[PDB]
């Protein structure tokens, strides 16, 4: 139990009680030679992603991906911090390799849609997020990227329903609600935006997007 308690503690959510997750990370790193463990690296990557350490996301996930390039748990965070770094060649390579590796996984189609978003081809990203969403009904990135495609396309009425769907399917996820509130700004409807942003800020006290909004 001395080790498995910590191992289970690693896998909880990262927004709250962040420091204890860190101390558990050094606890595993010491006395157990598990610093090389893949899931320890995954936890550290998610720590870095939470406060938006996207450069550290890139470096750590590149170190882990060299050993294994198809860890499905690792990959979505790497897509996120790659699109944040706004680079198309490496996203492009990984997406085209995953397409021929795992044709039936929504992960690769999500990566393709992200690549098209990075290339600002909204029309194709529409379909390539729709396919990823259809493949995995439990894939929040799919719905939020879908509504991102809607919002960046020019039309927003369907983006409203999309963000509402993403919010309702996944209760307790602040990001769909936050993006829906950004859209409310886009329609100049601030009255719902106040409540939605308060709800999002209830669990995200320190992140640039919330405070900027």
């Amino acid at each position: 139990k001395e080790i498995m308690k910590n191992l289970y503690k690693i896998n909880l959510s990262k927004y709250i009680n962040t420091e204890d997750i860190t101390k558990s990370n050094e606890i595993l790193a010491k006395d157990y030679k598990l610093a090389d463990n893949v899931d320890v690296v995954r936890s550290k990557v998610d720590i870095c992603y939470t406060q938006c350490k996207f450069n550290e996301c890139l470096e750590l996930c590149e170190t882990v991906l060299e050993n294994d390039e198809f860890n499905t748990n690792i990959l979505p965070a790497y897509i996120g911090c790659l699109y944040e770094l706004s680079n198309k060649n490496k996203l492009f390579l990984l997406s085209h390799r995953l397409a021929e590796t795992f044709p039936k996984s929504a992960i690769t189609w999500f990566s393709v849609a992200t690549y098209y978003m990075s290339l600002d081809r909204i029309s194709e990203a529409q379909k390539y997020y729709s396919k990823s969403s259809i493949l995995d009904p439990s894939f929040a990135a799919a719905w939020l990227g879908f509504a991102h495609t809607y919002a960046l396309e020019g039309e927003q009425d369907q983006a409203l329903t999309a963000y509402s769907t993403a919010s309702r399917f996944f209760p307790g996820m602040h990001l769909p609600k936050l993006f829906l509130g950004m859209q409310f700004m886009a329609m100049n409807s601030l009255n719902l935006a106040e409540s939605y942003f308060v709800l999002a800020y209830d669990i995200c006290p320190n992140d640039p997007l919330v405070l900027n909004e």
Partner: peptide, 30 residues
């Protein structure tokens, strides 16, 4: 996660019109 592009503030035409007008009466003052 696909982070949304943060919204950016724009310089409106009404405020710049107000400022250029105020400058017009400012130079008309003396």
């Amino acid at each position: 996660m696909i982070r949304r592009a943060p919204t950016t503030l724009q310089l409106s035409h009404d405020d710049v019109t107000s400022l250029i007008d105020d400058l017009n009466e400012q130079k008309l003052k003396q």
